[PDB]
Amino acid sequence: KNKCVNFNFNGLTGTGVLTESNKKFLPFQQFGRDIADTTDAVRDPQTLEILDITPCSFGGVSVITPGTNTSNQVAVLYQDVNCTEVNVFQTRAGCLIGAEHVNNSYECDIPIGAGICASYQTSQSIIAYTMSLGAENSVAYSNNSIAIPTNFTISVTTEIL
Amino acid sequence: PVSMTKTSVDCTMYICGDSTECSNLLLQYGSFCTQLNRALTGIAVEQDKNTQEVFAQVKQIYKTPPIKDFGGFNFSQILPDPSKPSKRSFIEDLLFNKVTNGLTVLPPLLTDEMIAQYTSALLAGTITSGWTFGAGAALQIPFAMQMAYRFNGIGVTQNVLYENQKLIANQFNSAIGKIQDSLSSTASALGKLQDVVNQNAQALNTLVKQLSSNFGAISSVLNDILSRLDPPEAEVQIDRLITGRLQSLQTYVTQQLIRAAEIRASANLAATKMSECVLGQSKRVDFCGKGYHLMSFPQSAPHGVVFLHVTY
Amino acid sequence: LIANQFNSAIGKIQDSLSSTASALGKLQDVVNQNAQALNTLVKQLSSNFGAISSVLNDILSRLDPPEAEVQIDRLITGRLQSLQTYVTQQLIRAAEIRASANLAATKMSECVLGQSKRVDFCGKGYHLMSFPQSAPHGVVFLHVTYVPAQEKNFTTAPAICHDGKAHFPREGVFVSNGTHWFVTQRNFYEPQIITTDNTFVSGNCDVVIGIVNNTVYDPLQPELDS
Ligand SMILES: *[C@@H]1O[C@H](CO)[C@@H](O[C@@H]2O[C@H](CO)[C@@H](O)[C@H](O)[C@H]2NC(C)=O)[C@H](O)[C@H]1NC(C)=O
Ligand SMILES: *[C@@H]1O[C@H](CO)[C@@H](O[C@@H]2O[C@H](CO)[C@@H](O)[C@H](O)[C@H]2NC(C)=O)[C@H](O)[C@H]1NC(C)=O
Ligand SMILES: *[C@@H]1O[C@H](CO)[C@@H](O[C@@H]2O[C@H](CO)[C@@H](O)[C@H](O)[C@H]2NC(C)=O)[C@H](O)[C@H]1NC(C)=O
Ligand SMILES: *[C@@H]1O[C@H](CO)[C@@H](O[C@@H]2O[C@H](CO)[C@@H](O)[C@H](O)[C@H]2NC(C)=O)[C@H](O)[C@H]1NC(C)=O
Ligand SMILES: *[C@@H]1O[C@H](CO)[C@@H](O[C@@H]2O[C@H](CO)[C@@H](O)[C@H](O)[C@H]2NC(C)=O)[C@H](O)[C@H]1NC(C)=O
Ligand SMILES: *[C@@H]1O[C@H](CO)[C@@H](O)[C@H](O)[C@H]1NC(C)=O
Ligand SMILES: *[C@@H]1O[C@H](CO)[C@@H](O)[C@H](O)[C@H]1NC(C)=O
Ligand SMILES: *[C@@H]1O[C@H](CO)[C@@H](O)[C@H](O)[C@H]1NC(C)=O
Ligand SMILES: *[C@@H]1O[C@H](CO)[C@@H](O)[C@H](O)[C@H]1NC(C)=O
Ligand SMILES: *[C@@H]1O[C@H](CO)[C@@H](O)[C@H](O)[C@H]1NC(C)=O
């Protein structure tokens, strides 16, 4: 149990991790199915125990990199995995290797997911952080205070379509 | 609706899940699967762009002062509620509570807490600074006088507001209470968001169920074909399964592309409404609610946005 | 000052476009998407799809018609599915591009050919005018917008009392530098003396919340006195 094995029960075969499940089969039932017709629990033919099948962990391997024109140092994101199945950072978006966790929040440069971004900042190395939404501000609101601009700036912005 | 669910699917594991012979047969088809993954990744990047366009419209994260003298207008049900763990409003909490094989679901780049922070910033800016924070630096203005400006923007002189301020504040509070009660009572309101969620769920479920179809082969189980037939005939059967499952992926990806185009149109509409309707005051008829538009308040929602259109 | 600011802004646009190339990522994305689709379409010609050779001429020169038929059928199936995929992706992408083109046509009509009051539709700020510029497979708009710059705190009031009559400003807002009260246009500080030509009277002083007291200078009284 608790190990990625290529099992072969009575007639049904697969790969996964077998774990002690708490499902309650009926005495004549042999294996369970998910909502999408995928087998997830099997009753062991020798000892009448119910084993939950979880797929062997997998996911994409995403490489985070600044431009090679800038640097050739990269970080790797192992999506939706435990960091033990692989300077190692566990995030909601996966396991991040090669990037230094920072408590500062900056403007997002390279999006990773679940609020984590990455950037190449200084002696320079890859950093990972909770991205900043903006410079937090409080308006001086009161029931008799108004702000009126005494000057203006004519700005020309470029929009491309 | 603003965004879909960022779903990515791996061919080799979907079509030929952990099978050497099947993977070798799948190699003959070229870059079909590279381009499937490319299409799905483009969709997911577009989803993040949708959310960022709709919500990340405010430069600074404004916050309402602890003193709530808004001329009698009561925004307690839409402003953030620190008592809850996630800094969401009462109505945002109602909205969030009302919505219920190589397949990965990538998390959105902005978390729900960040979306709520953006909507909080937009509410604080609109309340404490009118439409000025969209044009430039947020300029404070008393909320009664801002409502006077909005009344003047629909062709009613500001003396009407100043003389009927108490009645107007009571009517606005009553309207907010009605919104609360409807969104607590009936779930038929958020059908637009629940339909997107359900459509995506049905699409993925059908995609998985397609792995139980023969497509003409002797069996839909691939190891069973391998253990039953000799390689020359197992090749034919596995090619049948590969053609069927590859067609299932192509159908799913095409359908997701079309649905994502629809969602991107909806998200562009939401971005336009946030810009012209929350950050300003719209003279476009019926674009911002049925009536003469006064102001609008955004609320985040599961994979979407909710606008509270205050109209005269 | 305004002419100088506009000229400086155009110069800064020149500097940005001659400095950083990341501005035209929107056009480059279209070009790269189409090129990648065509590259995939071409590379799909070199796949076997289960046939003995990816090259049609080799199968034709190597097999008798009965078996060449089977092999060519396999290749035809594969390549026809490749074109089906390419055309479907192109139709979806062309719908997206047509949405962008409709948006750009709307921006030209409402943004160059007129002055838009829609917020953030024509650049961030108060839209003044927009100048179109052609670009490879696209259009570039230079949105000249008015942005308020230097704001000063003021004390404000919804109305003022003169003789039991409540004066509201006609087009502007009552402000006070601390002692004297003025009426100013709400987007640019130019104080003005509160007169009956700047305000209008409606109702009495007992209703408006936040009303203050000041003298509304009647122009006609000094003329009558003189
Ligand atoms: C198959 O045989 C094994 C042993 O030959 C059985 O295992 C025993 O099961 C009983 C009841 O479950 C236990 O009390 C014993 O402790 C088990 N022995 C061992 C060594 O583990 C098993 O139950 C048999 N199963 C069937 C279906 O006949
Ligand atoms: C409004 O802002 C402009 C821009 O900062 C000010 O003009 C500047 O004035 C200084 C002092 O004379 C000059 O050195 C700059 O060259 C000017 N800028 C430009 C772009 O010409 C202007 O003085 C401000 N007006 C007020 C009333 O404060
Ligand atoms: C704004 O409205 C809310 C909701 O009606 C008010 O909160 C209620 O206040 C009463 C009286 O203090 C309490 O009995 C309720 O339990 C409160 N309800 C909730 C949901 O908190 C709030 O007092 C109003 N604010 C003002 C300034 O009147
Ligand atoms: C508010 O503005 C008024 C009007 O400009 C100021 O009063 C004038 O102040 C100047 C110099 O401070 C004097 O030369 C004038 O004679 C004053 N005119 C009147 C009618 O009093 C007033 O000082 C300003 N208040 C503040 C706090 O700046
Ligand atoms: C503005 O001026 C009026 C008139 O002088 C003030 O009204 C007076 O209020 C006091 C106390 O409320 C009464 O004792 C007087 O009788 C009122 N005047 C009259 C003629 O009846 C008013 O209070 C002033 N407002 C401010 C903010 O100073
Ligand atoms: C790297 O970027 C700089 C701009 O910062 C550019 O001038 C330079 O040409 C780039 N290098 C290459 C090899 O393109
Ligand atoms: C992933 O595995 C590690 C090691 O067992 C564990 O500490 C971590 O909690 C796991 N992930 C989650 C989300 O629990
Ligand atoms: C970041 O915050 C965590 C949580 O308190 C703390 O343990 C860690 O030392 C912090 N890192 C730095 C560099 O201060
Ligand atoms: C106006 O006053 C408030 C509170 O005194 C202050 O926070 C704000 O910076 C002031 N505005 C300006 C433009 O200085
Ligand atoms: C503004 O609030 C303060 C604080 O209580 C109060 O003293 C003042 O009368 C209020 N003014 C208006 C116009 O609401």
Numbering used by the authors:
A (entry chain A): 535 to 620, 641 to 676, 689 to 727
B (entry chain C): 728 to 827, 856 to 1067
C (entry chain A): 922 to 1147
The authors write:
To develop an understanding of the structural basis of nanobody binding affinity, we carried out the biophysical and structural characterization of a series of six nanobodies targeting the receptor binding domain (RBD) of SARS-CoV-2 spike protein, comprising a hit from screening a naïve nanobody library and five affinity-matured mutants derived from this parental binder; two of the mutants have been shown to be potently neutralize the virus. Recognition of the RBD by the nanobodies is dominated by CDR3 and CDR2, with CDR1 only making a few contacts. At the heart of the interaction of these nanobodies with the RBD is a salt bridge π–cation interaction involving R52 from CDR2 of the nanobody and E484 and F490 of the virus RBD. As a result of binding to this epitope, the nanobody directly competes with the binding of angiotensin-converting enzyme 2 (ACE2) and thus is neutralizing.
Single-sparticle cryo-EM confirmed that the parent H11 and variants H11-A10, H11-H6, and H11-B5 bound to the same one-up–two-down conformation of the spike that we observed for H11-H4 and H11-D4 (29). The spike protein on its own is dynamic but the binding of the H11 class of nanobodies apparently “freezes out” this motion consistent with the increased entropic penalty for binding.
